[PDB]
C-alpha cells in the first residue's frame, strides 16, 4: 500500500552479491538477462521494494487481475527491469501478527501502473448514501496481511524487490563494472584503454602528458600514446610489425632453392610465427 | 533505535487527544510518517500518512483525525475527534526518509474509547 | 531567506575588449610540437566583453547562458561566491548551484527557488579582528536534490585571474579554469594562458540563462572592490599551436582577419612571402519573396475525402484536382487517418509547392 | 446517376419471372450488367453478366435463364427459368463505367420460390 | 458490396483500371461460357463484416 520511490544514479550497477547470493528465491527481469546486466548501462531506476502475499505474487507480474493489481500496485506488460523475490517470515514476521504489511481492499475503480493514490475518502459499494464516517455500505478499504510464523506455503511474507527504470530519456550515468587486465608491455596485443581500440605494442615513453590528457596524437591524428588510467603513466603505442614480404629466386630450371625478404622487419619478430632460422641476415631494406 | 512516543491515554467519548511521534535526526524537512493502528484482538490497519507537505485519511478516520507536523521541533501532532469505542487501538507511528529507508520501529502507546 | 538590495548607482553596463584571453583545450589530447585547427565554441580574438564593477553600485543582473560564457574575474580580496544556473530559477526545474570558500566548495544542482536577489552574507568587523562568514542567502528550499557532490578548494591591486570558462554540450558541464599574476594592465592583460579543464558535470539539463554570487544592512549599502567579465562564445574556427610540453602557447582565430585567414589555411603562423588563396566570397540574400497565382478557390478536398460513396477497387474513383489553393495542413494534422504516407515528398512541405496537376483515387 | 431494381414477386416452382433494373443515365449500354446473389443469411454469390458481345452465367443458373439487353432503353433485364425452390436469394445487379470508376448498386429483390 | 478483381491475364499496367466482367481462361484447356471448376469468375467480394 506505501510503496516508496527511490532515485538511483551515478553509480555503478554491479550484480557481484545481487546475483550470485541465493538470500534471493526469484532473480527475475523481464527485459534482460541476468548476464547482460552488468555488461550494459542504464538510466535512472525507480526501485520498488514490499512485502505481500505469498500467493498474490502473480499480481506482481503484470497482466494480472485481482485486489493487489486493481487496488495497490499495478504493472505495465511492457516491464523491462527486474523482479526479486524470496522468502522473509524470519524477518517480517512477528509474534503477535505482522499486520503492519497492509494490501489495499476497496477501490471506487481499478487503478493504472505507477499511481499513487494515498486519498481515501468516502467509498460506497452501493448507491445508499454513506455521510460522515460510517453507514451502510461503507466497507473499509484496507486490510492487513495474515503474517504469522505459522503461515504455510503461498502465505508466509515474501519480499519482493522490482528494479524499474526508463531508458532513452535521459543521459546514461550509470553502467556494470568495469574489469581491469594485468598490463603487458613489449608485446603486440589488443590494447583497449577506456574503449578505445586497436592493435599495437605499449612501450614506456619519454613524453609528460599533462594531468587532463589521456591521449596522445601525432600530425596524422592517430593515437600513438595513452596515459594509463590506473597507474597514471604514458605508453607509446607502435604499430605491430609488418611489411611486404619478397621471396629472391633464381631460375626454377637453375634451381628450385629460394631467399625470402622480410621488407622493412627486424630480424627479431620473423619467428613469431622460414621462422626457424638457420639463414639471418638483417639488411637496411629487411630481414 | 526507536521512535519516541506519547500522547495514549484512556479517554471516554467526546475527548481531545493528541498523538506525538518525533523522530531523531537533522533531515525532518525530507522525512514521510506513515501510520498504524491495532485494536486488542483485532486486525491492525493503516490510519494516515502524511508525506512531504500531503495529508491523507482512511475511511474511519477523515475529518475525525487532524493530522500536522511540526517543522521547528520535529514533532508530529495527530488531533483527535469524534471518538468511537471501535477505535480503541494500539498506535504504530513510522518515520522515514524520500526513499523509505532509516526504518525505525515505534512502540506504540495504549489508547482506549470507552462506551457509554 | 533573501533579501532585495534594491540600493544602486544607475551606471549603463560599459564594454572592454577581451585581447587574447578566453583560449582553453578543446579536448583532452596531447600534442608535441605540432600546430592544430580545431572549431569548437572559443572567445573570438579582439571581441567586446561586457564589463561590469561592484562598487554604491552592485551589478547582478541575469545573462542569457546562450552557448558557452566566458567569466572572468580580476577580483582581488575575494568576495566572490559563485554562480547560478539553469533556465527557470523557481523551483519548478532543476537549477546549479556552485559557491566558495577558504577550504571548501560545493556543487549544488536541486529544481532551487531563487529569489531575485541571491547574494551571501559577510558580516563587519564583529570586533574580533577578522571578518567572519554567515547569513547566506541564495535560495529559499531545495525540493529535488540530485547532484550535489563536494569538490576540493579552488581558491588562489588587483593580483589574482580566475578566467572560467563554462560549456554544457549533451548536458555536459564543462568548466575550465587558470590562475596567474597580474601587474596593474587594469583592462585583460595581454598575454596568452590556456585554460585547463576542471570538471564534468552529467547535469542532463538545458541551461538558458546564468547569474554569478558575490559576497556581502541591504538599503543604503556600498559593494566590495570588485570587477568580472562577461563573454559570449560563438563557433569560430581557431589554429592552436602546442610546444613540446603540449600547453598552448599561442593560438590564431581562423576569422578574424586575412592574415589570420591565411594562417588558418597554410597551417602555419608564419606565412611566406606571396599570394594565398583563401575561403570564398558571397553575397548572402537580403530579404524572401514568394509568388503564387492568386486564386481564391479552395479545392474540394471536403467531398474528395469524406466522401460517403467510395467505389470499389477495381473501379476506383479518379478525380481531377485542378485550379484551386489545395490545403494539406487541415489532412496532416488531423490525426484521424491511420497511414498519411508521402514518397515523392514531406506530408509537412505540402504548404508550399505549387502543383502542375493532382489525381485523386478513392476506393 | 443510381439505379433502382424492382420486382421480385410471389410465384410457383419452375415458373417465369420478369425482373428489371432501370438506371438513371445515357450510356447504359456501355454500363454492362452483373447479376449478384445472396442467400437469406448466408455467404454472397453472382448470377449472370451481359457484357455487350457475350454472356457469362453462374453455375447454379447455368444456361437455365435468358439474360436480354434493352439498349435502346439503356435498361438490363433477367429471364427466370426453371426456377427451383432452392434458389430463394436476393437477386442484385449492377454496373461500373469504363472511366472514372464508380458503382451504382441497387438495392435487393426477392426470389422467394415455393416447394410441392 | 465492395467487390475486387482477381483473375487476369497479366499485371495491369500503372494506373490503369481493369474493370472487364469477361471470364477469365484460368484452366490450360479452355471453357467458355458461364464455369465449372475452371474459367472462373474473375471477380469476388469482400466480406467486410463489423
Ligand atoms: C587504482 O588502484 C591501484 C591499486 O589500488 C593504485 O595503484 C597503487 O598506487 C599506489 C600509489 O602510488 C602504490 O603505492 C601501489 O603500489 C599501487 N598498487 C598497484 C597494485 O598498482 C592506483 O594508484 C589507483 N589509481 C590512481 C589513479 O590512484
Ligand atoms: C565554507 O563554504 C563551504 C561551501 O563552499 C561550506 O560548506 C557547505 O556549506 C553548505 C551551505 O549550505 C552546506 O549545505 C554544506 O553542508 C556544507 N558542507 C560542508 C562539508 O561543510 C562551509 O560551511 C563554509 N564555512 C563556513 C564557516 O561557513
Ligand atoms: C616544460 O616544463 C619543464 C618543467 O616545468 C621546463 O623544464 C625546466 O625549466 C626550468 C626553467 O628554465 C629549468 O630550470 C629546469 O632545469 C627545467 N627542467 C627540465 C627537466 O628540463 C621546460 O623549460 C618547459 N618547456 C617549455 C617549452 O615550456
Ligand atoms: C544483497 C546483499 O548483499 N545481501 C547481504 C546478505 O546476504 C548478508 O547476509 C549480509 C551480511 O551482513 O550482507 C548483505
Ligand atoms: C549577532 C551576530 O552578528 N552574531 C555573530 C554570529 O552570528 C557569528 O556566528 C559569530 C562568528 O564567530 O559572530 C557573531
Ligand atoms: C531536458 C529538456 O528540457 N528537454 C526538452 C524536452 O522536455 C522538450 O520536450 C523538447 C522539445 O519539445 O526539448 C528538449
Ligand atoms: C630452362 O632450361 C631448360 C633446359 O632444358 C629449357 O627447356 C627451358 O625452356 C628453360 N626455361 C626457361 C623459362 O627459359
Ligand atoms: C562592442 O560593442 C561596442 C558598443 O558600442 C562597439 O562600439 C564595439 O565596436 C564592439 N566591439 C567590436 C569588436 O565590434
Ligand atoms: C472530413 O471529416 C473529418 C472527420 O469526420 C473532419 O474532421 C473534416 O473536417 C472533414 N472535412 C472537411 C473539409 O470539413
Not at chain 1, 202 to 207: D, G, I, R, V, Y
Request: with cysteine; proline share 5%.
Amino acid at each position: 500500500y506505501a510503496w516508496n520511490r527511490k532515485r538511483i544514479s551515478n553509480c555503478v550497477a554491479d550484480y557481484s552479491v545481487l546475483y550470485n547470493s541465493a538470500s534471493f528465491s526469484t532473480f527475475k527481469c523481464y527485459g534482460v538477462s541476468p548476464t547482460k546486466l552488468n555488461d550494459l548501462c542504464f538510466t535512472n531506476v525507480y526501485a520498488d521494494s514490499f512485502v505481500i502475499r505469498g500467493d498474490e505474487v502473480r499480481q506482481i507480474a503484470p497482466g494480472q487481475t485481482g485486489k493487489i493489481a486493481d487496488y495497490n500496485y499495478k504493472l505495465p506488460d511492457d516491464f523491462t527491469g527486474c523482479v526479486i523475490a524470496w522468502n522473509s517470515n524470519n524477518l517480517d514476521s512477528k509474534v503477535g501478527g505482522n499486520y503492519n504489511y497492509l494490501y489495499r481492499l476497496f477501490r471506487k475503480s481499478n487503478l493504472k501502473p505507477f499511481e499513487r493514490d494515498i486519498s481515501t475518502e468516502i467509498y460506497q459499494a452501493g448507491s445508499t448514501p454513506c455521510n460522515g464516517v460510517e453507514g451502510f455500505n461503507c466497507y473499509f478499504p484496507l486490510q492487513s496481511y495474515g503474517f504469522q510464523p505459522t503461515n504455510g506455503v503461498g502465505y508466509q511474507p515474501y519480499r519482493v524487490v522490482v528494479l524499474s527504470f526508463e531508458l532513452l530519456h535521459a543521459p546514461a550515468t550509470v553502467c556494470g563494472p568495469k574489469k581491469s587486465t594485468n598490463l603487458v608491455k613489449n608485446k603486440c596485443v589488443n590494447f583497449n584503454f577506456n574503449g578505445l581500440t586497436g592493435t599495437g605494442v605499449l612501450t614506456e615513453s619519454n613524453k609528460k602528458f599533462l594531468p587532463f590528457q589521456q591521449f596522445g596524437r601525432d600530425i596524422a591524428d592517430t593515437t600513438d600514446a595513452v596515459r594509463d588510467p590506473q597507474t597514471l603513466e604514458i605508453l607509446d603505442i607502435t604499430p605491430c610489425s609488418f611489411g611486404g614480404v619478397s621471396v629472391i629466386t633464381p631460375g626454377t630450371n637453375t634451381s628450385n632453392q629460394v631467399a625470402v625478404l622480410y621488407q622493412g622487419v627486424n630480424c627479431t619478430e620473423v619467428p613469431v610465427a622460414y621462422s626457424t632460422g638457420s639463414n639471418v641476415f638483417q639488411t637496411r631494406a629487411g630481414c | 533505535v526507536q521512535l519516541q512516543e506519547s500522547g495514549g491515554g484512556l479517554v471516554q467519548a467526546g475527548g481531545s487527544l493528541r498523538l506525538s511521534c518525533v523522530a531523531s535526526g537533522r533531515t525532518f524537512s525530507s522525512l514521510n510518517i506513515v501510520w498504524f493502528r491495532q485494536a486488542p484482538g483485532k486486525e491492525r490497519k493503516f490510519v494516515a500518512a502524511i508525506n512531504d507537505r500531503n495529508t491523507a485519511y482512511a475511511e474511519s478516520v477523515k475529518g475525525r483525525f487532524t493530522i500536522s507536523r511540526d517543522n521547528a521541533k520535529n514533532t508530529v501532532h495527530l488531533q483527535m475527534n469524534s471518538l468511537k469505542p471501535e477505535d480503541t487501538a494500539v498506535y504504530y507511528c513510522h518515520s522515514a526518509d524520500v526513499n523509505g529507508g532509516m526504518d525505525y520501529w515505534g512502540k506504540g502507546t495504549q489508547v482506549t474509547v470507552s462506551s457509554h | 531567506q533573501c533579501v532585495n538590495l534594491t540600493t544602486r548607482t544607475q551606471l549603463p553596463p560599459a564594454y572592454t575588449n577581451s585581447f587574447t584571453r578566453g583560449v582553453y583545450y578543446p579536448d583532452k589530447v596531447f600534442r608535441s610540437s605540432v600546430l592544430h585547427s580545431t572549431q569548437d565554441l572559443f572567445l573570438p580574438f579582439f571581441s567586446n566583453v561586457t564589463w561590469f564593477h561592484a562598487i554604491k553600485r552592485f551589478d547582478n543582473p541575469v545573462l542569457p547562458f546562450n552557448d558557452g560564457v566566458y567569466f572572468a574575474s580580476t577580483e582581488k580580496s575575494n568576495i566572490i561566491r559563485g554562480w547560478i544556473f539553469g533556465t527557470t530559477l523557481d523551483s519548478k526545474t532543476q537549477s546549479l548551484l556552485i559557491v566558495n570558500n577558504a577550504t571548501n566548495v560545493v556543487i549544488k544542482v536541486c529544481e532551487f527557488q531563487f529569489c531575485n536577489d541571491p547574494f551571501l552574507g559577510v558580516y563587519y568587523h564583529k570586533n574580533n579582528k577578522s571578518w567572519m562568514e554567515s547569513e547566506f542567502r541564495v535560495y529559499s528550499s531545495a525540493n529535488n536534490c540530485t547532484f550535489e557532490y563536494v569538490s576540493q578548494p579552488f581558491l588562489m591591486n588587483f593580483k589574482n585571474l580566475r578566467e572560467f570558462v563554462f560549456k554544457n554540450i549533451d548536458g555536459y558541464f564543462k568548466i575550465y579554469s587558470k590562475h596567474t599574476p597580474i601587474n596593474l594592465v587594469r583592462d585583460l592583460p595581454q598575454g596568452f594562458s590556456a585554460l585547463e579543464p576542471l570538471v564534468d558535470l552529467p547535469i542532463g539539463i538545458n541551461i538558458t540563462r546564468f547569474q554569478t554570487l558575490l559576497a556581502l544592512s541591504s538599503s543604503g549599502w556600498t559593494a566590495g572592490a570588485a570587477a568580472y567579465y562577461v563573454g559570449y562564445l560563438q563557433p569560430r574556427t581557431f589554429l592552436l599551436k602546442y610546444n613540446e610540453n603540449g600547453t598552448i602557447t599561442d593560438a590564431v582565430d581562423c576569422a578574424l582577419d586575412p592574415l589570420s585567414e591565411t594562417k588558418c589555411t597554410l597551417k602555419s603562423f608564419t606565412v611566406e612571402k606571396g599570394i594565398y588563396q583563401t575561403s570564398n566570397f558571397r553575397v548572402q540574400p537580403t530579404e524572401s519573396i514568394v509568388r503564387f497565382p492568386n486564386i481564391t478557390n479552395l479545392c474540394p478536398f471536403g467531398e474528395v475525402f469524406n466522401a460517403t460513396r467510395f467505389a470499389s477497387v477495381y473501379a476506383w474513383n479518379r478525380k481531377r484536382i485542378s485550379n484551386c489553393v489545395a490545403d494539406y495542413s487541415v489532412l496532416y494534422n488531423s490525426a484521424s487517418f491511420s497511414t498519411f504516407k508521402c514518397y515523392g515528398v514531406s506530408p509537412t512541405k505540402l504548404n508550399d509547392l505549387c502543383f502542375t496537376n493532382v489525381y485523386a483515387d478513392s476506393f
